[PDB]
Design a protein around this nucleic acid. Sequence first.
RNA 1: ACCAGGUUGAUUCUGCCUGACGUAGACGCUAUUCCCUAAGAUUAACCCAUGCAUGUUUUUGAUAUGGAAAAAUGGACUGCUCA
RNA 2: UAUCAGCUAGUUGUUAAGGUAAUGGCUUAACAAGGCAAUGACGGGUAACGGUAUUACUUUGUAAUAUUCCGGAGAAGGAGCCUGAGAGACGGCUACUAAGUCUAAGGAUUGCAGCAGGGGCGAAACUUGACCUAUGGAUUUUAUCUGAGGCAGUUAUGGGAAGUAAUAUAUUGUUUCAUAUUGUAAAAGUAUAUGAGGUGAUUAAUUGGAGGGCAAAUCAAGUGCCAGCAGCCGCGGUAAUACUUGUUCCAAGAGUGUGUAUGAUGAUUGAUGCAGUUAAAAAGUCCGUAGUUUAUAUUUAAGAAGCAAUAUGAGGUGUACUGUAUAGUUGGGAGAGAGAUGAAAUGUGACGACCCUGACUGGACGAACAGAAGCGAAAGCUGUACACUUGUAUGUAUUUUUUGAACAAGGACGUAAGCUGGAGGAGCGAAGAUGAUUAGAUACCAUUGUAGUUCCAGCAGUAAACUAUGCCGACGAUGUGAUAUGAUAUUAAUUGUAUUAGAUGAUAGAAAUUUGAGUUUUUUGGCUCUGGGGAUAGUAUGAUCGCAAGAUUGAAAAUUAAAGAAAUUGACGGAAGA
RNA 3: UGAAAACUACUUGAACAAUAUGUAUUAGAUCUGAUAUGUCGUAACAUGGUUGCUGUUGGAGAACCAUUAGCAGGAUCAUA
RNA 4: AAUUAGAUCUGUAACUUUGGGAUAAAGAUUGGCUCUAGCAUGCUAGAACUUUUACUAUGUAAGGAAUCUGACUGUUUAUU
RNA 5: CGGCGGGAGUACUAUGACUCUCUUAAGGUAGCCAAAUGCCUCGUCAUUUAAUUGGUGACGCGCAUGAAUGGAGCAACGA
Lengths: 138, 56
Amino acid sequence: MNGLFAANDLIKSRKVKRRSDPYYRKKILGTKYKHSKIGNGPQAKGIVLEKTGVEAKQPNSAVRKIVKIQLIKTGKKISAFVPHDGSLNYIELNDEVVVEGFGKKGHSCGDIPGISYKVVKVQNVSLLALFKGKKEKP
Amino acid sequence: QINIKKAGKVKNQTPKVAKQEKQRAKTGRCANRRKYEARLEMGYFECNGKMKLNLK
RNA sequence: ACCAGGUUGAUUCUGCCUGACGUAGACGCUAUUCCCUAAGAUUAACCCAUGCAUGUUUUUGAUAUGGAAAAAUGGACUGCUCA
RNA sequence: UAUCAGCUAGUUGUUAAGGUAAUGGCUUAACAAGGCAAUGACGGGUAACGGUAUUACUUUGUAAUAUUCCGGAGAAGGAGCCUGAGAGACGGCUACUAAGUCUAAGGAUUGCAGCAGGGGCGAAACUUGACCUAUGGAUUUUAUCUGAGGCAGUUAUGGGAAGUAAUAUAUUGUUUCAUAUUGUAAAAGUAUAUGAGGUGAUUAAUUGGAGGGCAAAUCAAGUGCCAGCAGCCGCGGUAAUACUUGUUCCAAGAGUGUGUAUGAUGAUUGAUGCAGUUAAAAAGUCCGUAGUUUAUAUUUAAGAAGCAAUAUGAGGUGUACUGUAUAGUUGGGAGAGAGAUGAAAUGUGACGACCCUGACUGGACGAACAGAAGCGAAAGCUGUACACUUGUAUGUAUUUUUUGAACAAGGACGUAAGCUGGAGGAGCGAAGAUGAUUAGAUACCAUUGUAGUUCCAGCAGUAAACUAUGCCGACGAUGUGAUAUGAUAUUAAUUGUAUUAGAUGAUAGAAAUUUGAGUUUUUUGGCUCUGGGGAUAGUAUGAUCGCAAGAUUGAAAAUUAAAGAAAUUGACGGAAGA
RNA sequence: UGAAAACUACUUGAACAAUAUGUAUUAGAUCUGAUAUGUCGUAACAUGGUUGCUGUUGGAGAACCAUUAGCAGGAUCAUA
RNA sequence: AAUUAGAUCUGUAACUUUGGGAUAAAGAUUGGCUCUAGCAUGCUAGAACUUUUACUAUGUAAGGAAUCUGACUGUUUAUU
RNA sequence: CGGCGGGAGUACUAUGACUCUCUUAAGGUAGCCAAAUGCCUCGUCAUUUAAUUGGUGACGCGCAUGAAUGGAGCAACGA
Ligand SMILES: [Mg+2]
Ligand SMILES: [Mg+2]
Ligand SMILES: [Mg+2]
Ligand SMILES: [Mg+2]
Ligand SMILES: [Mg+2]
Ligand SMILES: [Mg+2]
Ligand SMILES: [Mg+2]
Ligand SMILES: [Mg+2]
Ligand SMILES: [Mg+2]
Ligand SMILES: [Mg+2]
Ligand SMILES: [Mg+2]
Ligand SMILES: [Mg+2]
Ligand SMILES: [Mg+2]
Ligand SMILES: [Mg+2]
Ligand SMILES: [Mg+2]
Ligand SMILES: [Mg+2]
Ligand SMILES: [Mg+2]
Ligand SMILES: [Mg+2]
Ligand SMILES: [Mg+2]
Ligand SMILES: [Mg+2]
Ligand SMILES: [Mg+2]
Ligand SMILES: [Mg+2]
Ligand SMILES: [Mg+2]
Ligand SMILES: [Mg+2]
Ligand SMILES: [Mg+2]
Ligand SMILES: [Mg+2]
Ligand SMILES: [Mg+2]
Ligand SMILES: [Mg+2]
Ligand SMILES: [Mg+2]
Ligand SMILES: [Mg+2]
Ligand SMILES: [Mg+2]
Ligand SMILES: [Mg+2]
Ligand SMILES: [Mg+2]
Ligand SMILES: [Mg+2]
Ligand SMILES: [Mg+2]
Ligand SMILES: [Mg+2]
Ligand SMILES: [Mg+2]
Ligand SMILES: [Mg+2]
């Protein structure tokens, strides 16, 4: 298809080959509006229901502490990972949390299986500061 | 049959020693001045950075 | 006008993941000045308490020495939002 | 966007009239059959207001642009109209639908996508403040109005000019304090000057990190696969520079990090500019329309047609004959085992096998010659004689004059099984049933046994259908061969054209290998088809084919740091030789 | 037409019902595949103990067996 | 017992043994008088006027969605 | 013409792919169901209704279903 007067056959052929790009295919179908887990935003809110732990994959061995919540914007149930040592003792049930993502394009990183979200705020108190000990929990 | 009772075992167990107050650290171009004269005396520019700075 | 780490007892390739760097929104911690510049667009073009944003003019002169009405002239511009 | 290929009936045109400020199927009579499409009509989706001033990144240009300015549309949703130079107007009127509010119960009434402000929604966004100072509008705008428009308050939205010390404990003297003038619609604030007091451990610096990428500690104390850290690789088993605390060091600095989109890194979208034998990738093979493209000194090569040698060829189709062997019927002779396995067993024979003989009937197939030899578009093609029919190549003063290459739509052929109908059935033989081996065998071994494999008439369309190498065109190193045929030459040779086998060098390649897989980062002669990390998966769903089995087209949600190609060193073999 | 109130006929036409259809989204008894984490065998890799592998047609707890055609990516580039 | 029913014009689904389902379902029109227009000369289209509005004296299908069983046309206990 | 069994252990509970065992001619395969075929029985779940021993769709250790004594199946047709 190399010719001087072949612009009509060149554009029609190169649009077909571009559809096999795995990043461009999701842009056409619009999957980020259809199958989004959290919506379209940086954070979210929720209500805690359980305080349970999971076990990491081989070859490491530990117990990772998580929490099963229910979102407000959509209404679905989801699990999030408590990201610091000794931080679950602040958390009580029937409370509110704020959820932030991991930063690996919608996948799970580390040896934590099937979980892609982590807690950042409890009762409008920063959990990063509360581990440092600057504030106190009401 | 999963235990969550051992949450926060290590950090509450290690004993706390207090901080030691330090002089007020200089800030600004004088902070860059104290760092430049300290590097020039040990020949840090001549050996092309091949030494240990934090020595303890 | 620049690339690095990861498949093997060791080697050379194809191939992808990750690090380093921009542009718009939200968030954590900490803040002494001065000048410039911005602030309910993203979901709900969803519902509104209260107060205020369009009147001028001897053209005649209200049993009235300067204002009643009637006439004349503009309210179709300007401002707000993106269904 | 083809998992949207046909669509349109006031729709296309002619004549005539009405209506408008005006052209016009803009509306209405009569007549006619037109109008648009693979250069994508007609449909479906948008988390779609169009340009522009302005930002990035760049070797011919891409991406963002609610934000400054120009243009278009709407005032809860729809429709209709008055006044008027200009409204299908909403801080103008009428009706219906969805929401309401006041009442003495007869009735009356409201549109904050105008400025403040409240409610809901959310991860997410400010004073129910003063004023006509400057720029403007309202038919002369020096005094009327102006929530248009200015002037101030709240906020880490960003960009600038700067601070937190300097000279050697001491000296001098920047901010945190106040006051005049200038200024303001009136008040701030900025600038110029002036006052006091005495401090840089001060009123005056934080955020992240210290195994590699990646600048900086094998520093100390606790805990022992626990608690925990880590974008990827990876640390934690009583001496951890890789978790918790404490000391010290590094990077940026009035800022510093965490996170969701979206660009660059990317020569992993390749026009410049990727790859298609073996890593993902050339439809099973030909014919042929739209689109793409072309040898020319404008008159001629090539192409197509046609002769000679009736050269050469398991090319195809149909009638007539023929070859031994296996199996069966039968006439003679004779009288115990025949047949198979590593070794045996069931089965089989005195109603006489097995062997040597004499005659017959049927079905399948052409041994040895038989090759790195021939023909065919591919799948394929070996007994003889005739009939019909067909290729490529070599020679040559034969006709015509550019008729060419490759191909979306369409068409034909296509081993082996498998289907419906009729013919036939010697050997072989899935399924089924028995005898041994075995812990177990429904498998390998052996004995039986049906469909099938044979012929005619049709459907069906899949293979490791492989040279795993699409088709056309120009140039290339020697040596030994093979098929056809012409010239020189003559019994002794060396030479022309078209195919084809192999060896040694030379190039190219990641390498094995290699006359193309060469003429390439010093990348371009023309044209069709296919691939973008593994797995889910050639799986679901829709459409088109088929008597059926099934065939072509062909995703996603949830997952995962590898999967893979060529080649060296070991180890192993119920592998082979010396 | 009518003194007017009003009656009659065309035009634009909001709203309310009955059905046909197009685009999204979502409950459901039962219940198919797939991914992430002990029991019974030994299909594949050496001639993996019956050499492997594609295509079709039948069997079966399970990998998988068996008839027929093909390929070397084989255990042979090779002996009148 | 009641509703539907004749004739003309539009329109017609799931399923399928590809013939059917189907006259599916669902809508609209119908008198009298005076004319115009075709050619086949007794049939069919259109127009104007008018009314206590038109197949209906007699004759004339209620419709749709599912399950069990028999393939269909046919025959049989003269008198339960 | 006819016929087509029973008991024991074995992978937090639970179940038994797998194994052992009495006999016999062979031990109901492909299919189908509380059906005109299911005693207990007005079986269990869903749906139809204000309310259902009725109707329809799923489940199966089926008193006593099952292959020309034919099994599975509804397009056309039915006082
Ligand atoms: Mg990141
Ligand atoms: Mg809005
Ligand atoms: Mg007045
Ligand atoms: Mg919008
Ligand atoms: Mg929009
Ligand atoms: Mg007309
Ligand atoms: Mg724009
Ligand atoms: Mg509103
Ligand atoms: Mg307006
Ligand atoms: Mg308007
Ligand atoms: Mg209006
Ligand atoms: Mg308003
Ligand atoms: Mg407002
Ligand atoms: Mg904000
Ligand atoms: Mg620190
Ligand atoms: Mg270093
Ligand atoms: Mg990190
Ligand atoms: Mg680190
Ligand atoms: Mg590539
Ligand atoms: Mg391979
Ligand atoms: Mg391959
Ligand atoms: Mg022969
Ligand atoms: Mg030849
Ligand atoms: Mg094309
Ligand atoms: Mg084709
Ligand atoms: Mg055919
Ligand atoms: Mg194929
Ligand atoms: Mg192929
Ligand atoms: Mg080929
Ligand atoms: Mg094996
Ligand atoms: Mg084997
Ligand atoms: Mg091999
Ligand atoms: Mg009439
Ligand atoms: Mg009958
Ligand atoms: Mg009787
Ligand atoms: Mg059964
Ligand atoms: Mg039945
Ligand atoms: Mg019931």
